[PDB]
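Suppose you are handed only these lines of text.
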Amino acid sequence: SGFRKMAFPSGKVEGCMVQVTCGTTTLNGLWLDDTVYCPRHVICTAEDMLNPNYEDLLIRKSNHSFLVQAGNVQLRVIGHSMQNCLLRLKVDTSNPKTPKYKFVRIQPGQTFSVLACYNGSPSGVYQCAMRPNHTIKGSFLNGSCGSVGFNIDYDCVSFCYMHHMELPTGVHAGTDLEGKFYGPFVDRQTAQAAGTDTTITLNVLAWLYAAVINGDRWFLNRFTTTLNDFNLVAMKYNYEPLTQDHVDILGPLSAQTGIAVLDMCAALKELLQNGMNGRTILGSTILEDEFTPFDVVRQCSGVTF
Amino acid sequence: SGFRKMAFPSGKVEGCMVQVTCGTTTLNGLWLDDTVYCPRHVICTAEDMLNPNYEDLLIRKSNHSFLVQAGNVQLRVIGHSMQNCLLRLKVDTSNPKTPKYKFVRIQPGQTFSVLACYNGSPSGVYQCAMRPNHTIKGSFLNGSCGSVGFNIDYDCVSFCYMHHMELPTGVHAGTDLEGKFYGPFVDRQTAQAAGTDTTITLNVLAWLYAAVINGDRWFLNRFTTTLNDFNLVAMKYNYEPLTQDHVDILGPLSAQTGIAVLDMCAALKELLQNGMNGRTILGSTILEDEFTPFDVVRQCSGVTF
Ligand SMILES: *[C@](O)(C(=O)NC(C)C)[C@H](C[C@@H]1CCNC1=O)NC(=O)[C@H](CC(C)C)NC(=O)[C@H](Cc1ccc(F)cc1)NC(=O)OCc1ccccc1
Ligand SMILES: *[C@](O)(C(=O)NC(C)C)[C@H](C[C@@H]1CCNC1=O)NC(=O)[C@H](CC(C)C)NC(=O)[C@H](Cc1ccc(F)cc1)NC(=O)OCc1ccccc1
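From them, the structure of the protein bound to WYR can be written out as follows.
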């Protein structure tokens, strides 16, 4: 029993983190096979951060402009290229600890684990959700750029995020491992702001199912609702509209608990209109939206209590 | 910026997890050098769980009664002994992935990372605090016994917890790596209950300092308080009494923020008496007590905003 925000074990990723230095700028890189991936802004200086021309900045560099360190070992770069907002540095040694892996672009609402790193050295691991506004609410300080996000399936690491920047609201933005940003953001220090965010409805419902699987039913009720009537209430409380696809995704959790999706929607509508009345759900006094249906199935018992 | 419950990177510990089977009972073990540690109740059968005599149960076993698997590799046990509530199984192979490590008994209020494991295979990592009542609020299912808790300093893993049992309130109990239980609990299925718990005052204050370091001062006030007057309020709200030792521990955070400890105590007293008025601190609508002063210094910027 119990329910916690849980990260994936980070071992397979720790063995891929390295340090990349260019001039006076140091940040993290990801070392897979004979390639090191890192944010392209490693080549920037303080003066040119407002409006850098990366093509022009990169053509001026050589292979020896980049210092790559794995632990105490120097890796000589033998080639380099730019891919969107990343640099790909070819190195002379293939990482012996390269796990089975792939690169995935995750969708808003989905979750992943972040390995926060400084100077190529891992400091911590935590779970994050990609917000509807394409930011994440992380914990990142100076030097954290190049830290990666990932999920694990069997022995395959799906990398989905590399960290680049912090916005004025304290939230974080970055790219997939092909260097394409999540959201409309750009890697320059021109004024940018996160769009307005929304609560991830599908995840709140998943988490309500988790609470029932763990033995708690207090928030259920005898009512039901239509999709449309639910969505009127969702719009009022800044929740994402629920779609039939979302209803279908909740099928397995619905089957395991015997609670119809639209009945759980009625329960959520009631929680939104009346509040929680000083009660808790899975230890929380608020409605949690950073657990996906898949997170719930992974962590919870296959048998309800 | 940002603040999150953060676990230690789990790599050094993942390489130590194995599977231990005795009869029809399988659980996890910890493989360091040529020893495998696991809960002694691996030798129990369903019928004898209520009142087992472990000395009598163990003398009836041989080395070949225990099957130890590391990944797909069988490790032959060549010796065994009982140490308090653990078994120590000597094996024929020394773990090549043994990290620098030590065994520590942590104190109530302190935090650690748990690597949840099933069948000797890690499934997730999360941060936990040892509660004042010597339990933890974890996420553990059937098969999780033998999963370990730890902290990391430099390259040294300090193991502090091994999981044994779940109590009726859904909370969890276990031992240090010498097999001595945290709290008054015993490894038998006789009626036992967690003592009443208390909020970890020192941690709440640490987390308030973190909120100030991250740029938020709304909950501060012009008042101060004595230790004694604070402790009258603490007793009313089921908070641990604050001691001079706790005040001294908060010295560095106090110095970095310029806020006197007893002034922060006045701020906390006000939060307890008036509530939060629909406002948040570091993303939370409630007072968080699972971050130690040391957790805060580790994660936060060395410079206030
Ligand atoms: C990584 O590049 C990094 O770790 N670099 C090391 C070599 C020091 C950082 C990670 C940041 C630092 C703090 N938390 C983080 O996640 N990333 C960057 O420094 C970005 C550089 C690229 C050219 C994108 N820039 C930013 O993250 C800035 C932060 C900032 C905030 C206040 C301030 F006064 C100066 C800088 N954010 C940003 O520029 O967003 C757009 C914006 C600009 C101006 C006004 C509003 C929004
Ligand atoms: C591990 O031994 C384990 O993973 N074993 C695998 C071989 C299946 C489990 C981990 C538990 C399972 C669920 N969540 C967990 O953390 N530990 C145990 O099974 C304990 C065995 C030892 C002899 C201590 N026993 C317990 O954890 C029980 C759970 C329980 C709850 C309800 C119920 F009806 C039966 C069992 N808890 C317990 O016995 O505490 C004392 C108590 C007994 C009776 C009444 C009140 C309290």
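What can we learn from it? The interface with chain B takes residues 1-11, 14-15, 115-116, 122-126, 137-142, 166, 170-172, 214-215, 283, 285-286, 298-299, 301 of chain A (CB under 8 Å). The helical segments of chain A are 11-14, 54-59, 201-213, 227-236, 244-249, 251-257, 261-274, 293-299.
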